[PDB]
Every structure is written in C-alpha cells, then in structure tokens.
Design a protein around this ligand. Structure first.
Ligand SMILES: CCCCCCCC/C=C\CCCCCCCC(=O)O[C@@H](COC(=O)CCCCCCCCCCCCCCC)COP(=O)([O-])OCC[N+](C)(C)C
Ligand SMILES: CCCCCCCC/C=C\CCCCCCCC(=O)O[C@@H](COC(=O)CCCCCCCCCCCCCCC)COP(=O)([O-])OCC[N+](C)(C)C
Ligand SMILES: CCCCCCCC/C=C\CCCCCCCC(=O)O[C@@H](COC(=O)CCCCCCCCCCCCCCC)COP(=O)([O-])OCC[N+](C)(C)C
Ligand SMILES: CCCCCCCC/C=C\CCCCCCCC(=O)O[C@@H](COC(=O)CCCCCCCCCCCCCCC)COP(=O)([O-])OCC[N+](C)(C)C
Ligand SMILES: CCCCCCCC/C=C\CCCCCCCC(=O)O[C@@H](COC(=O)CCCCCCCCCCCCCCC)COP(=O)([O-])OCC[N+](C)(C)C
Ligand SMILES: CCCCCCCC/C=C\CCCCCCCC(=O)O[C@@H](COC(=O)CCCCCCCCCCCCCCC)COP(=O)([O-])OCC[N+](C)(C)C
Ligand SMILES: CCCCCCCC/C=C\CCCCCCCC(=O)O[C@@H](COC(=O)CCCCCCCCCCCCCCC)COP(=O)([O-])OCC[N+](C)(C)C
Ligand SMILES: CCCCCCCC/C=C\CCCCCCCC(=O)O[C@@H](COC(=O)CCCCCCCCCCCCCCC)COP(=O)([O-])OCC[N+](C)(C)C
Ligand SMILES: CCCCCCCC/C=C\CCCCCCCC(=O)O[C@@H](COC(=O)CCCCCCCCCCCCCCC)COP(=O)([O-])OCC[N+](C)(C)C
Ligand code: NA
Lengths: 625, 78
C-alpha cells in the first residue's frame, strides 16, 4: 500500500509526531495474517525493494535536527520486533552502492553521536562497501576510501569515530577490501598535498598504527603486492613517505614500529638510524627503486630529498657508482676516439687492428645493453622519452649506426661512410650525458633540456614558417637570367632563396639587393620584413624567453640532476653480479631487545633549537664504536 | 622585463583569444546540428523548475561539512 511511501516521506522530513502514528499502524498490520511469517513481511514493508534502502538509512541521508530522535524510535521499533540485527545491518542491493550500510552513512554524515548508538545497537563495524561508486574507475564519478567504516572516518578527518571504532572489540583493523588494501593503504591513496589536506591523514596514520601496535598492518601487501610504505612511493605521496621513513615513537611499550632511531645523543649533536629493511636495493621491489624509476608521478626529485633516501644514494655513489661512472666514460671516450681516428684516417694495419675490433665489439655491447634497457623500461608517454630514455635511444642509435656501417662496408654499398659520419657526430654529442655526477655540469645539462623543449623547439617552428614563407615569395619575383650572365640573381630558386635567408639570419656573406627582380622595391621590402621578424623579433625574443625559463628551472635544476644521477646509480648497481655486494650499509643493529635487528643507515645531525632531555636512546655511551 | 610581466598572464590571454574563435565557429553552425549543448533539463526545484545546467565535480578536504542541501540522495551518477 501507501504506508511505505508515507513512512519514508515522514522520515526524510524529520518529524517525530506522526512518525509514531505510522509505526503503530504497521504494528496493527502485523496482527493481520501474513500467511508466511512476521519478520520478513515487516522488513519488506520497511525497506525499498528496488535499491535496498531502509527507513533508518533514509533518515541518515536526510540529517535533520530531529534525526537523532528518529533513529532511536526506529531502532526501538525494530528491537521490539526482534529484527534489530537484520535491520541495522541492511545494505544496498544495487551494484552502484553495494555494501553500504546505515553505519557507513552516519559516519559519512559526520554524526558521531548517531554512529555511537548504532554500534552499541549491533551495527556491523566490518561491512565492506563494494559498490561501483565506492570503487570508481576515475576520480570524478566516485570516492574511494577503503569501503570500510573504520577507513571512512579515517579518510574524512573524524578522529573521534576512529577512536570509537578501534576500541570496539569486533572491529577488524587488518581487514582487506576488494583491492586488497588495508586501512593504511586507503590512507595513502586518500592522502594529498599539504595545500589540499591539512596533514590529517598523517596524524590519522600515526593514530591507527599506534593503536594496532604491530608490524602486521604495515607489512600487509595488497593485490598489487605493495606495502603501505611501498604504495606511498608508487603513488608519489611525499608527505606520507616522509613521515614513515623518518618515524620516531617516543612513548615506551611500543618502539619497534619506528623507522628512525637515535642510538645516542649528547647535547645538540645526535646520531639517527634510519630503517632500510624495505628501502634498499637488496629487496626485489623497494621504495628507492620505485621512487627513481616511476613514470606516473612528477615529484620524484622532491621525494629524493628525504633524509634516508638522499643519504642512501650519496653513500652508494661514492663507493662503486663514482668509479663505474668514470670507468664507463673512459671506455666510451676511447670508443669515440678510436672510431674517429679510423674514420678520419681511412684509405681513399697489423698493429692497430686491435683498436678497430674494439669499436665493433663495444658497439655490440652498447646495442645489446640499450636494446634490453629500453625493453624493460616500457616507455609510453612522449615526456617519458625525453625525461627517462632520451640517452637510451641516442646511444642505441649511435651504436647501431656503426653496426650498420660495418654491414654496408662488406657489401658493395658505398653508403657505409654516411652512417659512419653520423655515428661520429652523434657519438660526440652523447658525451653530454657524462656531464652528470658533477653538480655544476649536471645542472647545466638539465638546463639545456628545458631550454630546448620550452624555447628552442618553439622558436624553430615559427622561424621555419617565416624562412620558408619568405623563401617562396622572394624567389617568385625573380626574372630569368640573360643569356650572357647565368648567375644574375642569387635567389634563383626556392632552395637558393632559403639558403640566402639562412645566411642572412646567421650574419654570413654579403647582402646584395641588386638582384634580377622585376620589383626591386617589393623584393627589398620583403627582405627588410624578414630581418625585422627574424633578426630583430624572433632571435632577440628567444634570449628573453629563456631567461624566464632559466629562473624557473635554476631553483629546481639541482634536484632534477640528482634525479637523473640517481637513475644511473641504480642501473650500475644492477650490473653488479650476485657476489661483490659487500658495499651495503651498516650491519644489523639491536634496535629492540626482542631479537629485532635491522639494517640501518647512520645520520648525524646537530640542532640548537629544542634542547630536550634524551631518554629515548639505544646506547648510553655517545662515542661511536 | 615584458616577458616576465606577460608570462604570468599570457595563459589567460590565449584563452581569451581562443574563446573568440569558439564563438565565431558556433555562429557558423546552422539552425540545425545544435545537438552539442550541455546537460538537459534537471529538476532543480520540485515546483516545475527545470534548468539547463553544467555538471562540475570538485574535491575539497577543507571544511568537512554535513551535506543537507543536496538534490539527490544517491551520490552515484545516473
Ligand atoms: C675530461 C675531458 C673530457 C673530454 C671528452 C668530452 C666529454 C664532455 C662531457 C662531459 C665531461 C666529462 C666528465 C667526466 C665523466 C666521468 C667522471 C665522473 O663524473 O666520475 C667521477 C670519477 O671521479 C674520480 O675520478 C674519482 C675516482 C674514480 C677513478 C677510479 C676508477 C676505478 C679504478 C668524478 O665525479 P665527481 O663529481 O668528481 O665525483 C666526486 C664525488 N662528489 C660528487 C661527492 C664530489
Ligand atoms: C670501488 C669500485 C669498484 C667498481 C667495480 C666495478 C665492477 C664491474 C664489473 C662487471 C660489470 C659488467 C657490466 C657490463 C659492462 C659492459 C656494458 C657496457 O657497455 O658498459 C656500460 C657501463 O659499464 C661500464 O662501462 C662500467 C663497467 C661495468 C655502458 O655505459 P653507460 O654509461 O651505462 O652507457 C650510457 C648510459 N645510458 C644507459 C644512459 C645510455
Ligand atoms: C678543470 C677542473 C678543475 C677542478 C674541478 C673544478 C670544478 O668546479 O669542476 C666541477 C665540474 O667540472 C669538471 O670537473 C669538468 C671540467 C674538467 C674537464 C676539462 C678540464 C680541462 C681540459 C665540479 O663540480 P662540483 O659541483 O664540485 O661536483 C661535486 C658535486 N657536489 C658538489 C654536489 C658534491
Ligand atoms: C630535439 C629534442 C631533444 C630533447 C632532449 C634534449 C636533451 O636531452 O638535452 C641534453 C643536452 O644534450 C643534448 O642531448 C643536446 C644536444 C643534442 C644534439 C643532437 C645530436 C646531433 C648529432 C647528429 C645527429 C644525427 C641523428 C641521426 C639519426 C640534456 O641533458 P640531460 O638533462 O642530462 O639529459 C636529459 C635526458 N634524460 C633525462 C632522459 C637523461
Ligand atoms: C629543422 C629541424 C629542427 C629540429 C627538429 C627536431 C625534431 C622536433 C620534433 C619532435 C620532438 C618532440 C617535440 C615535442 C616535445 C615534447 C613536448 C614539448 O616539450 O613541447 C614544448 C612546446 O613545444 C612545441 O610547442 C613544439 C613546436 C614544434 C616542435 C618542432 C619544431 C621544428 C619543426 C620543424 C613544451 O613547452 P612548454 O612551455 O613547457 O608548454 C607546456 C607543456 N604543455 C604543452 C604540455 C602544456
Ligand atoms: C622543417 C622541414 C620540413 C618541411 C618543409 C620542407 C619544404 C617543403 C617543400 C619541399 C621543397 C620543394 O618542393 O621545393 C621545390 C619548390 O617548392 C616550393 O616552392 C615549396 C613550397 C612549400 C613551402 C612554402 C612555405 C611553407 C611554410 C623545388 O625547389 P627548387 O629550389 O626549385 O629545386 C631545385 C630545382 N630542381 C627542381 C630542378 C631540382
Ligand atoms: C629545414 C629545411 C627547410 C627546407 C629546405 C628547402 C630546400 C631543399 C628542398 C628542395 C630542393 C629540391 C628537391 C625537390 C625537387 C622537386 C621539385 C620538382 O620536381 O619540380 C618539378 C616541377 O614540379 C611541378 O611542376 C609540380 C609541383 C609539385 C611538386 C613539387 C613541389 C612539392 C610541393 C610539396 C607540398 C607539400 C609541402 C609540405 C610542407 C610545407 C621540376 O622537376 P625537373 O626540373 O623536371 O627535375 C629534374 C628531374 N626529373 C626530370 C627526373 C624529374
Ligand atoms: C636561426 C637559425 C635556425 C635554423 C633553423 C633551420 C635552418 C634551415 C636552413 C636551411 C638552409 C638552406 C637549405 C637548402 C640548401 C639548398 C642547396 C641544397 O643542397 O639543397 C638540396 C636539399 O638539401 C637539403 O635540404 C639538405 C638537408 C637540410 C635539411 C634541414 C636540416 C635540419 C637539421 C636540424 C637540393 O638542392 P637542389 O637544387 O635540388 O640540388 C640538385 C639536386 N640534387 C640534390 C640531386 C643534386
Ligand atoms: C592592401 C593594399 C596594400 C598593398 C598592395 C600593394 C600592391 C602594389 C602592386 C604594384 C606595386 C609594387 O608592388 O611595387 C612597388 C613596391 O611595392 C611595395 O613596396 C609594396 C608595399 C606593400 C605594403 C607595405 C605596407 C607598409 C608600407 C611600407 C612602405 C615602404 C616603402 C614603399 C615605397 C613606395 C614599387 O615597384 P617598383 O619596384 O618601383 O616597380 C618597378 C618595375 N616596373 C616599372 C616594371 C613595374
Ligand atoms: Na658577418
């Protein structure tokens, strides 16, 4: 009948005077012979069959000043009918909001008092909202938070509800959603920059982790096999990653959960130990490997400035990476030197044959190494080519040109010299890769890349239009040379016209306006217009435009160079065999007396700011030993 | 000096110049073919109030208010 519609309408408005009047009519209807059973008929009349929404869920979606009064009446009505368990735990049946219950709605509506009594009434604190809206494919048609009431309050900045939920005995903190994400994973995905979120996720992450007091939650891996620590690097959450990597728990009874430990401290001078169990090249997938080879984020250079990450790269740079980088340069420098000499001093012997074979063998080594390096990198976006694989191609292109030249050399084709020259020009141009390692040269090189893309490529496109646009125009009004003089005008054809204009732009040759033009005034008018457009306008503006880009890049070029250099460190470390890996960090340290040994990196810092009392140290003696 | 003063506002100027092209192209369209409008009539108010509205989705983790001034209870688009 119309009773169900009236109940929903009165519930939504927020009126309790007629709410009881509608309920007592339903109680009268219960006396009627349902012929099946009492509870099922009452639930069917009190719920919407199309979507599964109940009157209690209707009230929470329609928060009113009298909503709290409605909730108690509805719960009491259900309790008297012995249907309280199946009523408060009802969820939507449609796939759009499947798994959403009354407790989830109350938490979203920020009704702490209403949610408090629902839990005491028997609400399911482990319900999973596996609906399509709660797991959207994009960031506009839904909101992902972990599909659980514990995570919903955590992601909505509701610490009071989180504390109430955690204190509940039936709450499953380590519960996993459809993606396999735990509570910590959901916070990492939800977490954003400080300008967007008021660091509430970081505080919520600490509160939930301390309540659990175990490493099971932190070491849990989702369906993608990523820990919450690894997920922060995968999604580029620098704020969360910074907290986790440098994490100190001052309070006792729980200290193994920390990732940062101070073994000793004496006044302002103190040494800190950063955990590296899951942040190192030893493991298969780690934070350091992800934060360098990631292509879906644009804040890798900011993420490499963290205390453990920055020092870890520096320590391994000066051990093996520095020597290998110099060794690689020497082999490549001799590769181009030998290649240049044999090509320059080519015929137009028995003692120098070893050098010639070196170029052919080393070209194969570069071709094979770059062939697999690009293959495993999986470049998809155009920016990734110029920001992560530009030197992986030009080295490969230069290497295969030498191989191609050798292939054409043994045949009857004379085009081997053309490919050989291209290898020389590209090979010496590839030397700018080795500018990294040095801060001055490395920051200079990354400045070139931004200048080329932002300004040089943009400038060249407009210049060519003017160069070719005036090239056809100038060559158009050129009369045929007389039978006596066959070189009457230098702008004889389109190719000649462009060459003269190109020399004009670079200030070469002499400007002879006495061409064989039927309209000398018009011919000179276009020449002066070309000079103003190119020599005065385009050439001069390029210098001014780059100065704007130089200012914007110089404040961040240092981080970019370290990001580019850090990529080289990981590549060199992978080239190392199974053995020779004795260049790791400090060995096992007894961080906790409960057989807790972790590989840690020692960092010493001095700060004359807080002047605290050191009561959270590992070793009483400050002197290193 | 001029590049610095313009680069902070050249993006808006380009959109202003581009927006002029959009209106000119739209005027070139005939009476028909105008099926590329925005979202259709939406019941904003129950008193027979239907308006052509543009849907914009925004995310803001700042105020954390209680939503009691919405049009549809179901958040999922339909
Ligand atoms: C020179 C004429 C070039 C002609 C060709 C044109 C090429 C033009 C293109 C680019 C310019 C070429 C740049 C050089 C590239 C290789 C060197 C390099 O970067 O590695 C390092 C090897 O530093 C050492 O020499 C230290 C020990 C290594 C030698 C031992 C090898 C193993 C035995 C030097 O780097 P660094 O910064 O001094 O490292 C010091 C550590 N620091 C950063 C912490 C301070
Ligand atoms: C204390 C210090 C101890 C050091 C111990 C060392 C043990 C070494 C023993 C074994 C490792 C062998 C690995 C393969 C080497 C051949 C591969 C090759 O062509 O070289 C590569 C490097 O390699 C070098 O030239 C450096 C030596 C390695 C090529 O050089 P690259 O610079 O990679 O090429 C350009 C960079 N790019 C990828 C962006 C295009
Ligand atoms: C001349 C060399 C003088 C000594 C080095 C001078 C210098 O500042 O070089 C710079 C590069 O510069 C090079 O090392 C490349 C130029 C040297 C090769 C050509 C020499 C002349 C032939 C050294 O750069 P840096 O910034 O000192 O590199 C250390 C990086 N760090 C400061 C982050 C630890
Ligand atoms: C065009 C667009 C180029 C975009 C990349 C620019 C670039 O990397 O510049 C670099 C400057 O050094 C150079 O590579 C600039 C000089 C290139 C000359 C080309 C070779 C000509 C030789 C004949 C050609 C024959 C061709 C035959 C076929 C910048 O150095 P980086 O910032 O250290 O490196 C950036 C790339 N990475 C981040 C992926 C490592
Ligand atoms: C005669 C031969 C000369 C050499 C030709 C060599 C081959 C060249 C071909 C291809 C190499 C790859 C080019 C694109 C590189 C990636 C994009 C990029 O950096 O674009 C830059 C602009 O760039 C332009 O506006 C490009 C204009 C045309 C480029 C070709 C010029 C020569 C044409 C003949 C980015 O500029 P920005 O200010 O950072 O813009 C913000 C980014 N946004 C656009 C995403 C919002
Ligand atoms: C960046 C580059 C990318 C792409 C641009 C490459 C240039 C495009 C045209 C190719 C050149 C061409 O066709 O030249 C023709 C003219 O043809 C013209 O007059 C060309 C007109 C097209 C360009 C006009 C301006 C475009 C801006 C012929 O030129 P010519 O000098 O008369 O040739 C010598 C005489 N011969 C025909 C006996 C050999
Ligand atoms: C950075 C670089 C800047 C550019 C550098 C520029 C300088 C270098 C570029 C070029 C130098 C010359 C090289 C190509 C010469 C071809 C011309 C030709 O054959 O013309 C013929 C006439 O042709 C006609 O009457 C038909 C005109 C259309 C075809 C030619 C123009 C193409 C336009 C493209 C439009 C799209 C353009 C898209 C982009 C705007 C005359 O031929 P022929 O005298 O009989 O030839 C003798 C041999 N044969 C008898 C066997 C045939
Ligand atoms: C501010 C500076 C910015 C620079 C921006 C870019 C600068 C642009 C500057 C252009 C200068 C003028 C070029 C045309 C020269 C005409 C003569 C010639 O050999 O042309 C030939 C084409 O030859 C080419 O087109 C050569 C390849 C050049 C392509 C551009 C490289 C860009 C590198 C990155 C054909 O001439 P032809 O009369 O047909 O020859 C007879 C036929 N034959 C070939 C069969 C024998
Ligand atoms: C839209 C209307 C706009 C323009 C269209 C004009 C079409 C005129 C066609 C015939 C005239 C022509 O082109 O030749 C003239 C040049 O012409 C120019 O100097 C052209 C100037 C174009 C506009 C310049 C704007 C800025 C003024 C900047 C002022 C710069 C200084 C201007 C000084 C006067 C002169 O010809 P000539 O070479 O003496 O002819 C001798 C050969 N004959 C006798 C066989 C014919
Ligand atoms: Na000159």
């Amino acid at each position: 009948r119309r009773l169900k519609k009236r109940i929903f309408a009165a519930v939504s408005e927020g009126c309790v005077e007629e709410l009881v009047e509608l309920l007592v009519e339903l109680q009268e209807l219960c006396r009627r012979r349902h012929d099946e059973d009492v509870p099922d008929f009452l639930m069917h009349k009190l719920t919407a069959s199309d979507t599964g929404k109940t009157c209690l869920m209707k009230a929470l979606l329609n928060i009113n000043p009298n909503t709290k009064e409605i909730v108690r009446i509805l719960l009491a009505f259900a309790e008297e009918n012995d249907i309280l368990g199946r009523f408060i735990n009802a969820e939507y049946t449609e796939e759009a909001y499947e798994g959403q219950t009354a407790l989830n709605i109350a938490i979203e509506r920020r009704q702490g008092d209403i949610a408090a009594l629902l839990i005491a009434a028997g609400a399911d604190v482990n319900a999973h909202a596996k609906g399509a809206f709660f797991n959207p494919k994009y960031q506009h048609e839904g909101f992902y938070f972990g599909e659980t009431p514990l995570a919903l309050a955590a992601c909505t900045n509701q610490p009071e509800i989180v504390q109430l939920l955690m204190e509940h005995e039936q709450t499953d903190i380590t519960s996993r959603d459809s993606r396999g994400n735990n509570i910590l994973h959901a916070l990492v995905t939800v977490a954003e920059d400080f300008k967007t979120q008021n660091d509430f996720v970081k505080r919520m992450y600490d509160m939930i982790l301390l309540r659990s007091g175990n490493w099971e939650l932190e070491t849990t891996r989702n369906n993608d096999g990523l820990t919450p620590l690894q997920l922060a690097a995968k999604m580029g959450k620098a704020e969360i990653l910074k907290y986790i990597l440098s994490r100190e728990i001052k309070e006792k009874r729980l200290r193994s959960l920390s990732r940062k430990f101070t073994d000793w401290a004496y006044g302002p001078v103190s040494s800190s130990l950063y955990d590296l169990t899951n942040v190192d090249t030893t493991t298969d997938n780690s934070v350091l490997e992800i934060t360098v080879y990631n292509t879906n984020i644009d804040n890798r250079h900011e993420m490499l400035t963290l205390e453990p990450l920055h020092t870890l790269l520096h320590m391994k740079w000066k051990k093996f990476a520095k020597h290998m980088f110099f060794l690689s340069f020497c082999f490549y420098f001799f590769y181009n030197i030998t290649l240049t000499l044999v090509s320059y001093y080519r015929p137009r012997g028995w003692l120098q044959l070893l050098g010639r074979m070196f170029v052919l063998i080393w070209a194969m080594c570069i071709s094979v190494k770059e062939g697999i390096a690009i293959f495993l990198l999986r470049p998809s976006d155009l920016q990734s080519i110029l920001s992560d694989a530009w030197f992986h191609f030009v080295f490969f292109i230069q290497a295969v040109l030498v191989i191609l030249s050798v292939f054409l050399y043994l045949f009857a084709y004379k085009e081997y010299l053309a490919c050989l020259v291209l290898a020389m020009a590209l090979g010496w141009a590839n030397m700018l890769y080795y500018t990294r390692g040095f801060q001055s040269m490395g920051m200079y090189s990354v400045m070139i890349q931004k200048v080329i893309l932002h300004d040089v490529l943009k400038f060249l496109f407009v210049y060519i239009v003017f160069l070719l646009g005036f090239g056809v125009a100038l060559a158009s009004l050129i009369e045929k040379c007389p039978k006596d003089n066959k070189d009457c005008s230098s702008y004889g054809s389109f190719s000649d016209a462009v060459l003269e204009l190109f020399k004009l732009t670079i200030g070469l040759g002499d400007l002879n306006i006495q061409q064989n033009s039927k309209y000398p005034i018009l011919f000179l008018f276009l020449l002066i217009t070309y000079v103003i457009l190119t020599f005065v306008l385009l050439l001069n503006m390029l210098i001014a435009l780059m100065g704007e880009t130089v200012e914007n890049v110089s404040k961040e070029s240092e981080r970019i160079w370290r990001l580019q250099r850090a990529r080289t460190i990981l590549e060199f470390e992978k080239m190392l065999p199974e053995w020779l890996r004795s260049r790791f960090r400090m060995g096992e340290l007894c961080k906790v007396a409960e057989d807790d040994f972790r590989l840690c990196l020692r960092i010493n810092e001095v700060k004359w700011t807080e002047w605290k009392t050191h009561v959270s140290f590992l070793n009483e003696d400050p002197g290193p030993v």
